[PDB]
Structure formats: C-alpha cells, structure tokens
Amino acid sequence: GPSSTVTIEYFNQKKEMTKTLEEITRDFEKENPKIKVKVVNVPNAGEVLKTRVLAGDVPDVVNIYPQSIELQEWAKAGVFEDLSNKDYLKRVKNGYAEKYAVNEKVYNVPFTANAYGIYYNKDKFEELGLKVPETWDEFEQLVKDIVAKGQTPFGIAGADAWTLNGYNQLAFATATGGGKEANQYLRYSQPNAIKLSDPIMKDDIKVMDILRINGSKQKNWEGAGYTDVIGAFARGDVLMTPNGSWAITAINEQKPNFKIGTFMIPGKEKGQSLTVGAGDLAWSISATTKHPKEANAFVEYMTRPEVMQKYYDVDGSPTAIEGVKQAGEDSPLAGMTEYAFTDRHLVWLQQYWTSEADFHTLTMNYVLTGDKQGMVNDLNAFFNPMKM
Numbered sequence: 001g002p003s004s005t006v007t008i009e010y011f012n013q014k015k016e017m018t019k020t021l022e023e024i025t026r027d028f029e030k031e032n033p034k035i036k037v038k039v040v041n042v043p044n045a046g047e048v049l050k051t052r053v054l055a056g057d058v059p060d061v062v063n064i065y066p067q068s069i070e071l072q073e074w075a076k077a078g079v080f081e082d083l084s085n086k087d088y089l090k091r092v093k094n095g096y097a098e099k100y101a102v103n104e105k106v107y108n109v110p111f112t113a114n115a116y117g118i119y120y121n122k123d124k125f126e127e128l129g130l131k132v133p134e135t136w137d138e139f140e141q142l143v144k145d146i147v148a149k150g151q152t153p154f155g156i157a158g159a160d161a162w163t164l165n166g167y168n169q170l171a172f173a174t175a176t177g178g179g180k181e182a183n184q185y186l187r188y189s190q191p192n193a194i195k196l197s198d199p200i201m202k203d204d205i206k207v208m209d210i211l212r213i214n215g216s217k218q219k220n221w222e223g224a225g226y227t228d229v230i231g232a233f234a235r236g237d238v239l240m241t242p243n244g245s246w247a248i249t250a251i252n253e254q255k256p257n258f259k260i261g262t263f264m265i266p267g268k269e270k271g272q273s274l275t276v277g278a279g280d281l282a283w284s285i286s287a288t289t290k291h292p293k294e295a296n297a298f299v300e301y302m303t304r305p306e307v308m309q310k311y312y313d314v315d316g317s318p319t320a321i322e323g324v325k326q327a328g329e330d331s332p333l334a335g336m337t338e339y340a341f342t343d344r345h346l347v348w349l350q351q352y353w354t355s356e357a358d359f360h361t362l363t364m365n366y367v368l369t370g371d372k373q374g375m376v377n378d379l380n381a382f383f384n385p386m387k388m
C-alpha cells in the first residue's frame with residue numbers, strides 16, 4: 001500500500017552547530033513522525049551548493065548567506081520559494097528579512113546574524129583604569145595609554161587579512177555616515193573617484209592608523225593567524241582584538257582567566273558607533289522541492305521561540321526571532337550586539353561587490369606598510385572593475 005514518509009534535506013553551512021541542529025531535527029521528527037530531515041554537512045559546502053544548484057539539484061531547505069551574490073542571482077532565477085507571505089516570517093524582527101529582498105520579495109529567513117567589533121579584557125581595563133572609547137580620538141588614546149602602561153593593545157592576525165574586513169568597512173561606514181553612504185563612496189562612485197585628498201579617505205586613514213600606533217600589536221603579528229590571535233587574547237597577552245561575533249566560542253574554549261567584553265567601533269563623535277554583519281543561520285526553501293509542506297514545516301519549527309532558544313543558548317549569535325531570551329548585559333557579545341537588527345547594524349558592504357578578498361588584502365597591506373597612496377590606488381583597482 002501507500003507510505004507517506006518523506007525525506008527532505010537541510011543543506012547546512014554552520015558546521016560548528018551540527019550537534020544542536022541535529023538535536024533540533026530529532027525534536028522536529030518526534031513532533032512529525034512522517035517526516036525525516038537529513039542534515040547535510042559537506043566539505044567545501046559553498047562550492048558544493050553552487051555545483052548542485054547549477055545541476056538542477058537544489059536541497060529542499062538551504063542554509064545560504066543572504067548577502068551573497070548566489071542568493072541574489074538564484075532568487076532572481078526562481079530557484080527559491082517566495083516566503084514573503086509566510087505567517088512564520090512575521091517572527092523575524094521587523095525589517096530585517098527585507099534587507100535581502102530581491103525584487104521586493106523575501107526568499108530567506110535570517111534566524112541569526114553575525115556582528116563585528118572589538119573584543120576586550122574587562123579585568124585589565126578595570127585594573128588599568130581604562131574605558132571603552134566613544135570616538136576615534138578616544139580609541140587612539142586608549143591604544144597609546146595601553147602601550148604606555150606596558151601592555152599590548154591588539155592581537156592582529158597579519159597572515160589572515162580577512163579578520164580586518166569588518167574593521168575597514170566600519171572605518172568607511174563611520175567616516176561616511178552609514179553603509180549605503182560607504183558604498184556610495186567606494187562602489188557606486190565614478191571610476192578613479194577615490195583620492196588621497198578626499199576628506200573621507202583621510203578619515204579612513206585615521207581609523208586604520210589606530211592599528212599602526214607604535215607598540216600597538218603583538219610581536220610577529222605579520223605572521224600571525226586567526227587562531228594565534230584568539231589564543232593571545234584568551235591568555236591575556238593582548239588586551240583587545242578586532243573580530244566578529246563568530247570568534248566567541250573559540251575564545252571561550254581557550255579558557256580565559258578574565259571576563260570578556262566587546263565594544264562597537266566608534267565614530268568621529270559620540271553616539272555614532274556602528275557594527276556590520278549579515279544572516280548566518282539563514283534558510284531558503286527550494287522552489288522545486290517535491291515536498292513543500294514538509295520543507296515549510298521545518299523552517300516554521302525553527303522560528304518557534306523554544307526551538308530557536310536551543311540554538312541561541314549554544315551559539316550566542318544575535319537572533320532576529322521573536323520571543324527568544326537573549327543574553328544579558330554582562331555577556332561577552334553585549335557591546336557588539338547592543339544594536340543588532342537596528343539601523344546601526346549594517347549589512348556587509350560586499351553584498352553589493354563582485355568579490356571581497358582584495359579588500360581584505362589592501363586593508364592588511366596598509367597595516368603592514370602605511371603606504372597611503374598605495375592603499376588609494378588598491379581601492380580604485382578593486383572597485384573600478386565593478387563600475388563597468
């Protein structure tokens with residue numbers, strides 16, 4: 001006779017959360033005894049997804065970063081179901097799913113998002129009489145003060161340029177007034193429009209020069225990787241490191257002997273700090289799924305407060321889902337995520353770029369060399385192609 005059991009795939013890209021995602025899936029299956037959900041985790045998942053979609057083999061539910069060119073192009077080509085009118089989308093913070101809309105239609109549920117800022121050692125700031133900086137000038141002074149008191153302000157991963165993507169995007173964002181303004185200056189300006197003499201460029205150079213203050217970085221930072229800086233920070237060897245919300249689990253796993261805080265990178269004046277990030281646990285549904293009711297039931301389940309709470313309690317990334325109890329003001333990510341999901345939480349600028357690695361490289365190369373005109377030249381070289 002007939003069987004009704006159906007399997008859907010959930011194509012995961014959050015490998016760090018596989019255990020909890022699998023538990024969730026088992027809870028979903030106990031509530032829905034006729035649905036089986038396969039949590040797919042493969043190496044090189046981004047590239048595998050591209051291969052599968054191109055082949056016409058799209059997973060039923062897909063973890064896809066909604067800032068990506070792939071979400072944009074695939075959503076346009078009809079690869080994903082229009083979620084705009086789903087009741088469960090109402091559980092996402094007002095306005096936030098809409099930041100990745102395509103042709104005014106939402107194709108992805110952003111459960112969580114990353115953010116970026118400065119990790120710092122609360123204990124040593126307290127011992128040294130130091131405060132979170134609220135302007136560019138205070139952040140310079142903070143770094144100098146730390147050096148003067150015989151400690152090392154930053155762990156910088158000179159060998160992993162990507163770690164400074166957020167830092168330089170926020171330097172531009174704060175210099176220009178926001179994310180769209182920063183992309184106006186960099187991306188949607190005229191070819192070769194970026195000039196050393198520009199006030200914007202001067203301000204960007206100021207913010208970047210905070211990372212160039214004499215004595216500001218650990219010895220051999222040039223060669224240091226992400227893991228090295230996570231370790232230096234956890235050991236108390238450096239007082240701060242610029243990075244994203246994704247670093248916390250690794251920091252905690254190093255068992256620091258101090259309380260971790262975070263702060264937003266300030267603007268020129270008080271009350272002008274910003275952060276940057278995008279959807280992380282973020283799902284779309286195939287438009288060609290053989291089992292749309294079950295695929296939607298899985299996505300709906302994860303939007304429930306008691307289900308997302310299971311994920312959040314472990315992962316800690318800010319969540320856009322209603323009803324979740326987020327961590328308090330003393331939690332390590334509090335400063336970084338104070339303004340999550342607001343106008344002060346910009347979507348990564350590369351939403352509207354055709355690549356990003358070369359921006360990482362020009363950023364870190366400036367930290368290395370201090371060659372200001374070279375940096376301007378590198379910025380025009382990277383953005384000019386985008387402007388044809």
Ligand code: NA
Binds near residue numbers: 002
């Ligand atoms: Na059947």
